[PDB]
Design an enzyme around this catalytic site. Structure first.
Site, PDB file in Angstrom:
ATOM      1  N   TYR B 156       0.826  -1.206   0.000  1.00 27.37           N
ATOM      2  CA  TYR B 156       0.000   0.000   0.000  1.00 27.37           C
ATOM      3  C   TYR B 156       0.864   1.262   0.000  1.00 27.37           C
ATOM      4  CZ  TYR B 156      -4.340   2.629   0.654  1.00 27.37           C
ATOM      5  OH  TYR B 156      -5.420   3.478   0.511  1.00 27.37           O
ATOM      6  N   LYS B 163      -3.227   8.571   2.713  1.00 21.56           N
ATOM      7  CA  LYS B 163      -4.437   8.449   3.521  1.00 21.56           C
ATOM      8  C   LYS B 163      -4.239   9.017   4.926  1.00 21.56           C
ATOM      9  CE  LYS B 163      -7.205   6.484   0.487  1.00 21.56           C
ATOM     10  NZ  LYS B 163      -8.328   7.216  -0.181  1.00 21.56           N
TER      11      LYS B 163
HETATM   12  N1  LIG Z   1     -11.234  -0.195  -3.319  1.00 25.97           N
HETATM   13  C1  LIG Z   1     -10.906  -0.315  -2.041  1.00 25.97           C
HETATM   14  O1  LIG Z   1     -10.557  -1.394  -1.542  1.00 25.97           O
HETATM   15  C2  LIG Z   1     -10.834   0.931  -1.211  1.00 25.97           C
HETATM   16  C3  LIG Z   1     -10.822   0.801   0.172  1.00 25.97           C
HETATM   17  C4  LIG Z   1     -10.881   1.923   0.972  1.00 25.97           C
HETATM   18  C5  LIG Z   1     -10.931   3.164   0.392  1.00 25.97           C
HETATM   19  N2  LIG Z   1     -10.925   3.276  -0.949  1.00 25.97           N
HETATM   20  C6  LIG Z   1     -10.918   4.651  -1.592  1.00 25.97           C
HETATM   21  O2  LIG Z   1     -12.130   4.836  -2.272  1.00 25.97           O
HETATM   22  C7  LIG Z   1     -11.921   5.856  -3.278  1.00 25.97           C
HETATM   23  C8  LIG Z   1     -12.537   5.415  -4.582  1.00 25.97           C
HETATM   24  O3  LIG Z   1     -11.741   4.358  -5.160  1.00 25.97           O
HETATM   25  P1  LIG Z   1     -12.431   3.016  -5.670  1.00 25.97           P
HETATM   26  O4  LIG Z   1     -11.908   1.860  -4.909  1.00 25.97           O
HETATM   27  O5  LIG Z   1     -13.892   3.225  -5.750  1.00 25.97           O
HETATM   28  O6  LIG Z   1     -11.844   2.888  -7.151  1.00 25.97           O
HETATM   29  P2  LIG Z   1     -12.289   3.474  -8.566  1.00 25.97           P
HETATM   30  O7  LIG Z   1     -11.244   3.122  -9.566  1.00 25.97           O
HETATM   31  O8  LIG Z   1     -13.700   3.034  -8.935  1.00 25.97           O
HETATM   32  O9  LIG Z   1     -12.368   5.031  -8.187  1.00 25.97           O
HETATM   33  C9  LIG Z   1     -11.218   5.890  -8.065  1.00 25.97           C
HETATM   34  C10 LIG Z   1     -11.636   7.173  -8.729  1.00 25.97           C
HETATM   35  O10 LIG Z   1     -10.591   8.167  -8.618  1.00 25.97           O
HETATM   36  C11 LIG Z   1     -10.683   8.944  -9.789  1.00 25.97           C
HETATM   37  N3  LIG Z   1      -9.510   9.787  -9.945  1.00 25.97           N
HETATM   38  C12 LIG Z   1      -8.189   9.422  -9.960  1.00 25.97           C
HETATM   39  N4  LIG Z   1      -7.368  10.400 -10.262  1.00 25.97           N
HETATM   40  C13 LIG Z   1      -8.210  11.487 -10.454  1.00 25.97           C
HETATM   41  C14 LIG Z   1      -7.966  12.819 -10.830  1.00 25.97           C
HETATM   42  N5  LIG Z   1      -6.754  13.297 -11.132  1.00 25.97           N
HETATM   43  N6  LIG Z   1      -9.029  13.645 -10.937  1.00 25.97           N
HETATM   44  C15 LIG Z   1     -10.250  13.159 -10.693  1.00 25.97           C
HETATM   45  N7  LIG Z   1     -10.603  11.918 -10.348  1.00 25.97           N
HETATM   46  C16 LIG Z   1      -9.529  11.125 -10.248  1.00 25.97           C
HETATM   47  C17 LIG Z   1     -10.888   7.925 -10.894  1.00 25.97           C
HETATM   48  O11 LIG Z   1     -11.389   8.533 -12.082  1.00 25.97           O
HETATM   49  C18 LIG Z   1     -11.945   7.037 -10.234  1.00 25.97           C
HETATM   50  O12 LIG Z   1     -13.246   7.514 -10.558  1.00 25.97           O
HETATM   51  C19 LIG Z   1     -10.405   6.115  -3.310  1.00 25.97           C
HETATM   52  O13 LIG Z   1     -10.069   7.243  -2.506  1.00 25.97           O
HETATM   53  C20 LIG Z   1      -9.840   4.863  -2.640  1.00 25.97           C
HETATM   54  O14 LIG Z   1      -8.576   5.088  -2.028  1.00 25.97           O
HETATM   55  C21 LIG Z   1     -10.892   2.199  -1.756  1.00 25.97           C
END
Ligand SMILES: NC(=O)c1ccc[n+]([C@@H]2O[C@H](COP(=O)([O-])OP(=O)(O)OC[C@H]3O[C@@H](n4cnc5c(N)ncnc54)[C@H](O)[C@@H]3O)[C@@H](O)[C@H]2O)c1
Ligand SMILES: NC(=O)c1ccc[n+]([C@@H]2O[C@H](COP(=O)([O-])OP(=O)(O)OC[C@H]3O[C@@H](n4cnc5c(N)ncnc54)[C@H](O)[C@@H]3O)[C@@H](O)[C@H]2O)c1
Lengths: 271, 271
Positions: B156, B163
């Site tokens: 990570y 984060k």
């Molecule tokens: N997937 C998991 O296991 C997990 C767990 C905890 C938290 N999260 C967090 O949830 C959030 C959403 O991620 P996800 O897992 O839904 O994946 P995802 O790929 O569906 O979403 C990530 C999003 O970030 C956007 N993004 C990235 N760079 C960008 C930029 N420059 N401008 C605008 N948008 C941008 C992408 O377009 C995408 O829509 C993130 O912050 C991620 O760290 C994810």
């Protein structure tokens, strides 16, 4: 449509219509829950019975958690009438008031420590153990705690120690019961005053500090606590267990009072 | 009746129908919210627009948070069409995938560090700053984090550092905005198989560890996360701000894998 529609659960800790457990009861009933209540002593039963009736319940049972036979009898009656449980709220605490002033080190006794531990902490394990037998399809169990467990608060003294033990119980019970689909959580509530003002004596100075210096600039009320209880007891929180959830207007996140109060205290009290 | 009836809000971070932002959007829409969406990159417009249509929205705008002019243009459009915001969801994270395999110390570069910090952490401050001007009568702001902020998770790497910074922003923004009735919170979600989620090296082994060893013995889905977002964005959470709220099947509370897994690893890997 209601968040608790068709769910049945037990509320322990209503004493009057200012109790945190009563705020929880009112919000659960508004969301469709069928409720049972315990009461400590015949005097409180005469207060709790009409409050229960206001939210559509006539299922009201005596319980003193220090007397385990009364606790066994509560869950026996729940099994007789419902056959199962969807949720349980534990909102019970006690310590000798004479040890909730002065320094922890000066005033605490073993006798009060052990009694406080049983009533404020181990009773949660005891009712969780009994609830588990009635939650064959899963369920949600909630207790109430306070941030004096992990940061020192004047006068909270051995209750802070009891709450720290209670929070550890939340964690061990959640790890135990998670695989069966039973979630176990706590709300760490801010100080609540349903009466007007900040009060009298030491308590007023402690309460008003939290009011003035919490991010939301208000203390939570029993409806805030009750709405957060609805969340943790309902399917909205299906992913949440073992959580110490702060419902305290953000107070726990700050280190210091507002800048205006820092400056006045600096000038008043010096270096 | 719906928990978000009459409320209007912006969701940033939908990429496809598996995104956490999409699960949040579906639950908000089912509670009556009126929704606006951003999307990153021209090719994502054709994927986000039909999703937004499924929840009754065609208020869908391009935005790359690294290019602050596009962010300004989003909030200018919200001000002209709505004149105000009730809530904002920040679900945006990014890091160079080559630095999410190997040891943090071996693979991280300054260039990726700074870009990861801007996109994954500071963009939350930037959209909160702009949201505040449109929340004259209060509101709720939400971001998504992961427990690698405070406990180390292999691979990570700099996302954990980002984060940690994001969670500090939640606290500082909550303290700043609380007095005007704007609440600021995060959900620390468990692992979900998303596009971003697969960017970590050995994603399968890291994911299955949390599946097998979380108290609930399952990983959360975007509906669990979305329902918790409903809670934090709605009036149910009126007492809650500055909170890093774990929606992770209880995983953060355990130290070790299950006893069965402990014994198998002991036998296989030794002292
Ligand atoms: N997937 C998991 O296991 C997990 C767990 C905890 C938290 N999260 C967090 O949830 C959030 C959403 O991620 P996800 O897992 O839904 O994946 P995802 O790929 O569906 O979403 C990530 C999003 O970030 C956007 N993004 C990235 N760079 C960008 C930029 N420059 N401008 C605008 N948008 C941008 C992408 O377009 C995408 O829509 C993130 O912050 C991620 O760290 C994810
Ligand atoms: N009041 C606050 O500001 C505040 C803040 C945070 C947490 N809490 C916690 O919330 C819970 C409820 O307290 P409250 O503030 O609603 O006050 P309260 O007096 O209305 O409720 C406490 C309840 O515990 C019951 N109780 C005490 N000893 C008992 C025993 N031996 N057997 C059975 N029941 C017993 C009392 O009868 C009463 O119903 C407590 O655990 C308290 O620590 C309170």
């Amino acid at each position: 449509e209601g968040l608790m529609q068709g769910k049945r659960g037990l509320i322990m800790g209503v004493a009057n219509n200012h109790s945190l457990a009563w705020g929880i009861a009112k919000q659960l009933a508004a969301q469709g829950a069928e409720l049972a209540f315990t009461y400590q002593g015949d005097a409180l039963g005469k207060r709790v019975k009409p409050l229960a009736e206001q939210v559509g319940s006539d299922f009201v049972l005596p319980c003193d958690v220090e007397d385990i036979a009364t606790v066994d009898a509560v869950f026996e009656e729940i099994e007789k009438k419902w056959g199962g449980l969807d949720f349980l709220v534990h909102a019970i605490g006690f310590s000798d008031k004479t040890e909730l002033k002065g320094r922890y080190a000066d005033v605490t006794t073993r006798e009060n420590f052990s009694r406080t531990m049983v009533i404020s902490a181990y009773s949660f394990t005891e009712v969780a153990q009994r609830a588990e037998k009635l939650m064959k399809d899963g369920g949600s169990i909630l207790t109430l705690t306070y941030g004096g467990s992990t940061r020192t608060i004047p006068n909270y003294n051995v209750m802070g120690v009891a709450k720290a033990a209670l929070e550890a119980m939340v964690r061990y019970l959640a790890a135990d019961y998670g695989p069966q689909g039973i979630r176990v959580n706590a709300i760490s509530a801010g100080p609540v005053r349903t009466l007007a003002g900040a009060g009298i004596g030491d308590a007023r100075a402690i309460f008003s500090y939290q009011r003035r210096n919490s991010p939301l600039r208000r203390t939570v009320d029993i409806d805030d606590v009750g709405k957060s209880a609805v969340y943790l007891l309902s399917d909205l929180s299906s992913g949440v267990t073992g959580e110490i959830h702060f419902v305290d207007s953000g107070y726990n996140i700050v280190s210091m009072p507002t800048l205006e109060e820092l400056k006045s205290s600096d000038s008043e009290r010096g270096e």
